[model samples]
Target: MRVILDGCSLTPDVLYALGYEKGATIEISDEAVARITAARAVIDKIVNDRQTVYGINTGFTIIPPHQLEELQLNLIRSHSACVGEPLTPERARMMLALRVNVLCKGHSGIRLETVQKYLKAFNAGVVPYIPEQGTVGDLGPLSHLALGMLGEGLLATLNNKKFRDAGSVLRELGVEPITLAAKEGLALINGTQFISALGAEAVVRARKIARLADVALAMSHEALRATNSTLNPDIHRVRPHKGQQLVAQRLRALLHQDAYSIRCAPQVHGISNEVIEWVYGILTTELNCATDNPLVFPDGVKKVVSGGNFHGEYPAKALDMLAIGVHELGNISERRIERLNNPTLSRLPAFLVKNGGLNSGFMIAHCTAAALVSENKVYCHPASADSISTSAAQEDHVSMGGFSARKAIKVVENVERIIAIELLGACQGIDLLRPLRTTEPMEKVWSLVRSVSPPWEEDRVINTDIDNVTKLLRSGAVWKTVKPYVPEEARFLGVLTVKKPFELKSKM
Candidate 1:
């Protein structure tokens, strides 16, 4: 499918499809091209009239009093000071797409030709070799993006494991590099694209994991066979937070046929829904807003204004929230893993082994899960809380949004592994129960897990099994397996919907 960026409406699902899946093309509508061309003409006039613009004639930040046409190219070269490992091809492409979408908004005054070149680069998979560090919010790494389009930076291969010169890659792929004009260089480098792309990607994946966590917790509930009174629909009726009710109802539905822990999932799993939904609102707002500076309003009177839209505090805050939510998810999963391992609570053999103490069984696996959850707590510290002055204090009070997004992604990765470990322990407990069958939904999920990992017999090498299940968790296969049994409204947003909004339910 192709995504047409009118610079108005772009959703997370489309972003996910383009970034992770192939064969999705990006198209700029004729109306958008007209808008972009009109905005570009405004910048041309600003340059021709010798207007003392912030970035068109004067220098950037601390060095803004100079007058030179060559300053645009120098801006790209000097700001390419980021240092770290290269971003993956997928992330690089998403960055390129986001830049094009910003230009398509008809606000940044970037030329239509430059937008076309960016689209061509993305379609050709000419991923820029952007370093993962150095941006306060995103300017440091985004500068490397400007360097790539200038034919001076490095680029990664299609696989993203190796890299080559940007100029050679563009030439070989029939894509020509774009030259900077007027506000073009600033348009490309001084925005929140880097922070938004990474944060949006993390939020998208986190939402999927949120649903998978629901399934994993449900499986644990069945295996332990705890009391089913906590999740009674009547108890949920008293202290409803919308999302809690949504989670309680869904969990009750999943345990319809089971007699085990039909407990209130709202206490443990529902909080994640609030975090996920809040981040979704943040991402949706950012996906369609303009983040560039010196925005050109090309309609009547043509007003070009400069402001702090390029700052990434919004993305930083959202990603930090995501980190906290995912960490708590792992925290709850670890608690369940402990219950499953406790002989008195689980009613299963010690360590889930028949002859304990000899094999060591799941004792160490619980430790691994606990260790990862602990690590996630450290990563959840808000990166937006700290800031440093740059460019001689002209760019003071910067948002550490890039670091926040990166840390959120790391936290989610750890959460995936911890969830995988819990799944393994739960499946082992269910096997110990033997002759007693679980619900249809749980049995289906168990079948899916067993397909990737075999039933634990005596525990030879469990790391391989954990890794195998982690692959399934990361790929979202477990959620896909259980999605058929899920409520239609619950499929997209997990348990975050709570109640359908009053506006939607009764169109008053």
Candidate 2:
């Protein structure tokens, strides 16, 4: 859990090692630090000499050609005061990592003091509470300023915990906070870290869900005794969608040892893959580059170049696509869930429960999936298109990337629950099909489940089993057990790496 920090870079190796593959620990190389240090020196010349930069010395948005040298610092003092309920410690920690990681790339001219604070936050696990509101893509969400308030001791954790003031936590961890000079805080919290953190978390979870989708789909196929016709290789070659083709092929492989007749069926795994790839590509681009404004050069010279790099349009577009894909995933899955529980479709005992109407077989369980899917529709709307102007119309267009980020996560959580419900149904379907043998690979999975969860011969709290299994799904439990059964050509199962945290460094 020890995360090391060098002046410029913020690393998430802790998170990566704890559980992500794609998320790497960051390395603050001498070259990147040199770029950061050089940028600081240039800012020193600007500040000591009272330079008139786009953001450093000048007033923000339409403050009107004013020489506000004192005002520059006030912006930090005031903007940092975000109001309302603060973001969770985990979220705040991610924000801290994100800001630092981006700064580490040497684009944001943050001095050692500010950089050290982020390091302290990570190692100490001291979460600064940030309110979940404010920040329309144009100005990078003023609410992010709440992150600063948490720094100032304005909010407390749910555990009623208090932080050890500024460098205290770092002192205990043998870390130091970098000094903040002029526009460093502005640079650190300026761009899209808030949205990026939310977005990264969403994409990460999405990968987990995508895998669950494939697994649950396999179970659903068995439950319905879906014709192997769809999974046939020749069938997929005609459609040729990468996700559909891949998933179809995988389904056939997993079920080859089963007798339900899906061993050679072909279907739409490539369609799902194509959609996921599109969204993943956007996330890859967002995490790799510096998405801040007034970017500093290696020599500390601040360029007064005005650009819309801070806008979240790119990520927002990605979110829209991502949410849509997930929504559809749940949509298709809901149909399967319905079929699994239906008396005609499943032909299994009603509700998959021992006693029929008296206990109400999984009636409420299906409701959970329906509710989440309905909520997903609202989340699928594009957050990028809407914008509001602030600061006397000087800033007219906003990306609303925050909406996209939040919505994207909402969809991810929803899809996860949906998959959980689908699995519950599919597992019951398998139980009903008992004594009717399955492929060796499918039997292996059922055996793994049987180890922990006995067949539902009698009435029990199946929901608990459902919840536990989804948690297992997230922890990479099910996949580990099933991968050995998969052929080497089916290796794309590793793409789950893309969901790593934004601050994941390269070194770890």
Candidate 3:
């Protein structure tokens, strides 16, 4: 699993393979190195001729030739001011990979040698300790990463199980600290790589969770004895939304469905699926293109142009939309949990347990799902819609995309927990119907849930059950277990397919 960064061909799947899976090595393509070399020539020419470029020579100061290196170094030092919990090592690695891809585009005037050192550090698994907060776009986070490259900050390895000084880690890996050239530091930090990396991760996980949402919904449908009329192809044929129709087709394959949470899931989950696809496109483009300032084009005019490519509005708005879209999965899943627990709705024992009063049963679990669903509503507020002035108003109208991507990932995580609770309660409802069985596909889901979590005969600590089922959901076990039982026509589920089961190397 060698992920070659060609600056034009990375996808979400490949990004996940390198960043989270931790089994792959990274290399820059020959053409990408050639492009970086070509662009470096243009920067060197600018420096030799004393031409003033925005990021290279003019933005921070009209300094003399000898002072240029100090300027670049200071830019990274000053911007490494973020404070909060650090990003997970996998996410930090994703940021590193994304930055490498941007530099590989050869538009940021970064030298091929500097890019190679960065790639070498990444391949050696030098995960930078980047704080997760305090960024208008991503300068703060990326500067933290660049700080590690310069051997000036804290770094982590062994999947963040070990921490040490950046200099020590780089020396141990036999990698030299990068000395920033004219535009090297700006090239490294001034981009949407942080936002794009987090967004890409969210897209990958949201896609898997979207498929798992249907699996959970199918189990709930079986437990609730939902009618199968609303999933009729004729009903979906008249409305004709691609996501709605595809979800309906998939549900039909599973249940052999009919409530708003149960019946209209295709319509709800369909829009989320559509938004995930749309956001994936935006992130894929962001991952491949240059997002730093003062892009250097050596092709035709050999010109250096200052632009607002580093503005994170595109990824910001796309991630904000992603949060709102994926939030609906938990929103309706809570409703189904309610239906499964309510005696009037499910006709099962109160809270899906025998001897009602002696056992509180899934009552608190439904409340937990409700709580997470409500919490997602708050996180769904668009972080991209707000902005603040920064850099002494030089960077006015900041995109605030950092929080946008952060909260979108939060919403996805909350939704995972919510759906886990729903799966737990729904399985208990199925167990209550002791002699009966659901459709074969749904029965497979029940068995998978039982493999990780047991039935709730009487409530113990429900949190353990939730955690177990959540692992199954996150690891793609639920989808893999039930996928083979689905009919051939609906096997793909109209979302990104999990090519292999997630290895679950670390806690997600």
Candidate 4:
């Protein structure tokens, strides 16, 4: 699928395709090209007129008109200060796509050719080696990306084949390195794409995991023979929370619930769903808007406006909330894992395996789930809550949004594993139930799990079991296999499930 970049129509689904799927490609809309050309013309006129603009004529915060281009180049080189682990090729590609899309908005004063070059590198699968750390608002990572486009940094291929010099990669792709023009480097690196891209990834994964959470919940409910009484519409009707109501409806369709983990899933997982939807709105807006300093407006009030659009606060807080919200899925999932394993709780074979004391079937797996849950808690701490002064306090109260997006991704990953462990234990519990089958929907879930991971009789290395289920969860196979069986009433309870923000009403 070719995702056309109009700067207004990019969605999370398109972002996911660009980031992960090889068949997906991108093209700039004619309108976006016109806007980009108009905006660049404004910058050129300003430069020709020798008008003092923040990023165009002035150097970041001083510079001569003759040295403006050199200043832009130096800005990219100096800001490439990110350190620590490099971003995964997919995430780096996401950053590239996001940058291209934002530039297509045509307010950042970037040359049209420069924007096309970014698209070329992205389409050709030239992934910049951007370190994952050290950004108050993604300047570090984006500057590294800009440097790669300048053919002055390291680059990698789409499949992460091997690292190569940026110039070599550009040459191999028949693309030339770009020289920064007035405000071009600033426009390239001065946005929230790092936060938005990572937030985009987290939102995509968290949404999928949210659905899988229900699948796991159903399996665990069947494994423990938990009561489904709590899922009654009347129970949620009184509360009237959209997320809670939707989740209750879905659970009812799947085969029902008990315990806070099972019963309150609507409350816990539902709120996470709500937060994901909320963050989706925030990210969607962030993705299309120009989040750079000194935005150039060519229409109507033609002027250069230097502002704080580059601030990462929006995505930082959104991602921080995403991490906290998703952490609860793991939090409750671990408890369910415990109930499935402990004989006292589940009333099934110890660890869901025969010969209780002889085989420690799911004990270690439970511990693994617990460890992930605990780690998720640490990641849940709001990175946006604390801000540090930078650039000699000129940029004080900066958003640590990069870390927020990074940790939110971590939380989603941990939640995936936690749910996988729960599926493993729950499937084991289902097997012990023998000829007694669960609701049709849940039986389908059981069959899906059994397909990827066979029943664990004698505990050989179970890590492979957990990993396999995790893969299935990530691949969306579980949801796909069970989706057809979902009741029509509950079919739409999913990512961005709510059309708009929920409003509290006196009557349900």
The RMSD (Cα, Å) of candidate 2 is: 6.0
- Point out the worst 10-residue segment of candidate 1 by lDDT: 494-503
lDDT by residue (287-315, candidate 4, tens digit) is: 88788778888884747887898999999
Candidate 2 per-residue lDDT, tens place, 1-508, comes to 4333332223222333322332223334565567677767767777667656765555543232233434544555566544555565556556656666667666666675556555554544444556666667523233243233334334333233464353343344454434344666567666777776667777767765776677777877877777666677786688776776777766777777322223322233345556666666566556545766777664334254555677777877787777887777787777777777777767677777756756666767787888888888877777786777766756677777877877888888778878877876777778888777666766666676666666666667867877766676677676776677766546354443335445756868
TM values, all candidates? 0.92, 0.82, 0.94, 0.94
Worst 10 residues of 4 by lDDT: 492-501
C-alpha lDDT (0 to 100) for residue 1 of candidate 2: 42
Screening candidate 4 with a backbone cut-off below 3 angstroms (N, C-alpha, C), the clashing residue pairs are: none
Name the runs in model 4 displaced over 4 angstroms. Answer: 60-66, 487-508
lDDT (0-100) at residue 311 of candidate 2? 70
| lDDT ranking, best first | 4, 3, 1, 2
User: What's the lDDT for residue 315 in model 1?
Assistant: 83
lDDT values for all models: 0.78, 0.62, 0.84, 0.85
lDDT of 2 at 129: 53
Shift in Å, residue 58, candidate 1? 3.3
The candidate scoring highest on TM-score is: 4
| C-alpha RMSD by candidate, in order | 4.2, 6.0, 5.9, 3.7
Query: What is the Å distance of residue 462 in model 2 from its true position?
Result: 4.4
Candidate 2 residues lying further than 4 Å off, grouped into runs, are: 1-27, 48-51, 59-73, 81-84, 138-151, 155-179, 257-269, 298-304, 355-357, 487-508
Give the per-residue lDDT of model 1 (tens digit) for 66-147. Answer: 4353777887898899998978778877877877777778888888888899888877777787899988887778888878
Query: Distance (Å) between predicted and true CA of 81, model 3?
Result: 1.4
User: Which model is ahead, 3 or 4, in terms of TM-score?
Assistant: 4
Residue-by-residue lDDT tens digits, candidate 3, 327-435: 9999999999999889988989878888998888999989988888888889989998987775575667888999999999989999999889988888888899978
